[PDB]
Amino acid sequence: QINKWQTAVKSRKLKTGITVELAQDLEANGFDAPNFLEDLLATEMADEINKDI
Amino acid sequence: LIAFDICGVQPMNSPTGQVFALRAVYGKDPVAAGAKEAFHPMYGPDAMFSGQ
C-alpha cells in the first residue's frame, strides 16, 4: 500500500530597518554596514529556523 | 559663494572627530594651576627661569 504525507510550505518573515545615519556610523566604526544588516537578518532567521526544527 | 578660502577644512572619515594640541609647560608640573606656557606668543618668556 502507498500512502502520502503532505503539507504546504509555510513562511517566516523578518525586517530590520537601519537608518542611513546608522549605516554611515557603522562604516565609520569599522563595520561593513550593508553586509552587517544582511548577516543580522540571515543569522536571526537561521537561528529561528533551528528553534522551529 | 566665499567657498572655504577663509577657514580650515580637515574633512572627516568618521563623524564626531577630535583635535589635539601641544603646549610646552614649565614649573615642574605640566598640569597645575598657575603653570606657564613656554612658547606663548603674547606672554613673554620667563627670562630668568634657567638663569638667576
Curated annotation (Swiss-Prot), chain A:
It comes from the Viruses. Proteolytic cleavage at the N-terminus by the prohead core protein protease gives rise to the mature capsid vertex protein. Homopentamer. Interacts with the portal protein. Interacts with the major capsid protein that forms 160 hexamers. Belongs to the Tevenvirinae capsid vertex family. Capsid protein that self-associates to form pentons, building the capsid in association with hexamers of the major capsid protein and one dodecamer of the portal protein. The capsid vertex protein self-associates to form 11 pentons, building the T=13 laevo capsid in association with 160 hexamers of the major capsid protein. This is Capsid vertex protein. It comes from Enterobacteria phage T4 (Bacteriophage T4). The gene is 24. The chain holds residues 162 to 214 of 427 of the full protein.
From Swiss-Prot, chain B:
Coiled coil: none annotated. It comes from the Viruses. A proteolytic cleavage by the prohead core protein protease gives rise to the mature major capsid protein during virus maturation. Transmembrane segments: none annotated. Belongs to the Tevenvirinae major capsid protein family. Major capsid protein that self-associates to form hexamers, building most of the capsid in association with pentons made of the capsid vertex protein and one dodecamer of the portal protein. The major capsid protein self-associates to form 160 hexamers, building most of the T=13 laevo capsid. Folding of major capsid protein requires the assistance of two chaperones, the host chaperone groL acting with the phage encoded gp23-specific chaperone, gp31. The capsid also contains two nonessential outer capsid proteins, Hoc and Soc, which decorate the capsid surface. This is Major capsid protein. The gene is gp23. The chain holds residues 106 to 157 of 521 of the full protein.
